[PDB]
Amino acid sequence: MRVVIQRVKGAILSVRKENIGEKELEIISEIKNGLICFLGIHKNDTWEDALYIIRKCLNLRLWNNKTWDKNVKDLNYELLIVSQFTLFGNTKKGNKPDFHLAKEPNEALIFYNKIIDEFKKQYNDDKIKIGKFGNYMNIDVTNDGPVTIYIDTHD
Amino acid sequence: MRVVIQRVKGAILSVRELEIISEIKNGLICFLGIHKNDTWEDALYIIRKCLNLRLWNNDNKTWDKNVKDLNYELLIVSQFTLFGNTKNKPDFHLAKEPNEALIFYNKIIDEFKKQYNDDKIKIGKFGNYMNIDVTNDGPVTIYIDTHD
């Protein structure tokens, strides 16, 4: 699994609606302070992989007080989790990507939902927010720092 | 070197109540992490990629047109946190010394404009606390580490 974590003052998630027909976007999800986590599910991902993310994600002490002191949970903040397979975007070949290691949607989707459930269990039902899986989204992020964290659980 | 690339409809970079210093419409935002043992070949690879990766569709032809093809902007922001050791409080052992990093960074930015266009590259205020309003278009998130 791969995650890019962005510390934010807020985030506003929209998706393109299905039968649109003469607005095309729709805000389905919003958070104030907290993290936005772009989550890449690898084909060979185990649930132990998920656990690790869900942990570092809810636990890294990414805010000051002393520096790098409190985590998202401590401050009672939100997380927005967005599935992003482009992480597994291989770009060593041509100057055009290639997403072969990216766990195929229908399996990925379930794994994903399972992760999101765990998040709420470990934290709070009201603090975890998501996008619309596999749909084109439009995200307004207000980066606070910035603070960008990358994790690859195949290390 | 490490880069996180985000495809965007726009972004506004500001510093300290808030001063706008840098803004782009469609294009990429590149969070750049300069490694201590970074060579200029590392810089080059990044620059080649941010500038040539085809991250936009030709309605249906997905991954067809790169940033230049569409005459779009890039916003480059130094971000050392990419080299955070998270194996549960961060550890930036591997970053390149600031005073050195800054020069390397400016050198990279120059290259960007050379390879592309003076008017298409935008940046932040190095080492300062910034506030960035990104509008992610997808999203499309790309990660690269030249140490591969």
Distance CA B21, CA B94 (A): 29
CB atoms within 10 A of CB B123: 19
Let me know if B81 is a catalytic residue: yes
To one decimal place, what's the resolution in Å?
Answer: 3.3
- In chain A, residues with a C-beta closer than 8 Å to the C-beta of B135 are 138-141
How many C-beta atoms lie closer than 10 Å to residue B88's C-beta?
Answer: 10
The binding site of B for tRNA comprises 63, 80
Closest residue of chain B to A143, computed from CA coordinates: B132
Among residues B38, B64, B30, B20, which one has the least CA distance to residue B144? B30
How far is B94 from B68, CA to CA, in rounded Å?
A: 32
B137 touches chain A (CB under 8 A): yes
The single-letter code of the amino acid at B57 is N
* Contact by Cβ (8 Å): A102, A41: yes
Question: How determined?
Answer: X-ray
Taking the C-alpha atoms of residue A49 and residue A134, their distance in angstroms, rounded to an integer, is 21
Helix H segments across A60-145? 105-122
Is residue B43 within 8 A of residue B104, CB to CB? The reply is yes
Distance of CA A30 to the CA centre of its chain: 13
Side-chain-facing half-sphere of A155: CA atoms under 13 Å: 9
* Cβ-proximal residues to A134 (8 Å cutoff; 6+ apart), any chain: A83, A105, A109
For A50-86, letters b (16+ CB in 10 Å) and e give beebbebbbbbbbbeeeebeebbeeeebbbbbbbbbb
The position carrying tokens 């060593």 is A92
CATH superfamily of A1-155: D-tyrosyl-tRNA(Tyr) deacylase (3.50.80.10)
Distance, in Å, from the CA atom of A83 to the CA atom of A28, rounded to the nearest integer, reads 15
Q: B142: which 2 tokens?
A: 């790309």
Kindly report the nearest CA distance between residue A15 and chain B, in angstroms.
9
The values of phi and psi at residue A47, to 5°, are -70, -15
Distances from the Cα of A120 to the Cα of A40, A129, A131, angstroms:
19, 9, 15
- Residue A134: left (phi > 0), alpha (psi -120 to 50), or beta? left
CA torsion sign for B5, B8, B14, B15 is negative
Q: Which residues of A touch B66 (CB under 8 A)?
A: 95
* CB proximity A25 to B under 8 Å: no
Domain B1-148 listed as CATH 3.40.50.970: no
User: Residue B77 is encoded by which pair of tokens?
Assistant: 């922001």
For residues B110 and A37, give the distance between their C-alpha atoms in angstroms, rounded to a whole number: 31
Q: Where are the domains of chain A?
A: 1-155
Cβ contact A97–B53 (<8 Å) = yes
Among A82, A83, A71, CA closest to A122 = A71
Query: Among partner residues B79, B88, B138, which is closest to A136 by beta-carbon distance?
Result: B138
Residue whose structure tokens are 């309003």: B133
Query: Residues B72, B145: contact at Cβ < 8 Å?
Result: no
Count contacts between A and B (CB, < 8 Å): 111
Strand partners, A16: A25
Reported as type and span, the H/E element at residue A55 is helix A47-59
Is A30 an interface residue toward B (CB < 8 Å)? no
What is the distance between the alpha carbons of residues B137 and A138, in angstroms, rounded to a whole number?
Answer: 5
Return the residue matching tokens 């050791």: B85
Contacts of B47 in chain A (CB under 8 A): none
Start-to-end CA distance of chain B, whole Å, equals 10
Give the SS3 label for residue A127.
coil
What is the chain A residue with the closest CA to B78? A146
Print the SS3 string covering B33-53: ECECCCCHHHHHHHHHHHHHC
Is A68 labelled as part of a ligand binding site? yes
Residue with tokens 């400016």: B106
